Amino acid sequence: KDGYLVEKTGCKKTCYKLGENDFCNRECKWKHIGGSYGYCYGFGCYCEGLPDSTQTWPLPNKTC
């Protein structure tokens, strides 16, 4: 259960803070709450612990 965060257009969310990136925690802790771990990895928001039911990048076959 590990994916990235999407956006209105579906574009991921690059960040300038690797590791425990609160900015990613507050952004990941938005829709749904099943998520348990939200940190950045590779200059990108990454959430871990949320089932596919939640929203996560890459979005469906339709890119951003």
UniProtKB/Swiss-Prot annotation:
Entry keyword annotation includes Transcription regulation: no
GO molecular function, one term: toxin activity
Tissue: Expressed by the venom gland.
Chief location of this protein within or outside the cell: secreted
Annotated positions of the Cysteine amide modification: C64
Ranges for domain LCN-type CS-alpha/beta: 1-64
GO cellular component: extracellular region
Disulfide bonds: C11-C64, C15-C40, C24-C45, C28-C47
Keywords for the protein's UniProt record, in alphabetical order: Amidation, Disulfide bond, Ion channel impairing toxin, Neurotoxin, Secreted, Signal, Toxin, Voltage-gated sodium channel impairing toxin
GO biological process: defense response
Locations listed in the record: Secreted
Domain-level remarks: Has the structural arrangement of an alpha-helix connected to antiparallel beta-sheets by disulfide bonds (CS-alpha/beta).
Function: Beta toxins bind voltage-independently at site-4 of sodium channels (Nav) and shift the voltage of activation toward more negative potentials thereby affecting sodium channel activation and promoting spontaneous and repetitive firing. Affects channels from chicken and frog.
Family: Belongs to the long (4 C-C) scorpion toxin superfamily. Sodium channel inhibitor family. Beta subfamily.
Full protein name: Beta-toxin CsEI
The species this protein was found in: Centruroides sculpturatus (Arizona bark scorpion)
Classification of source organism: Eukaryota, Metazoa, Ecdysozoa, Arthropoda, Chelicerata
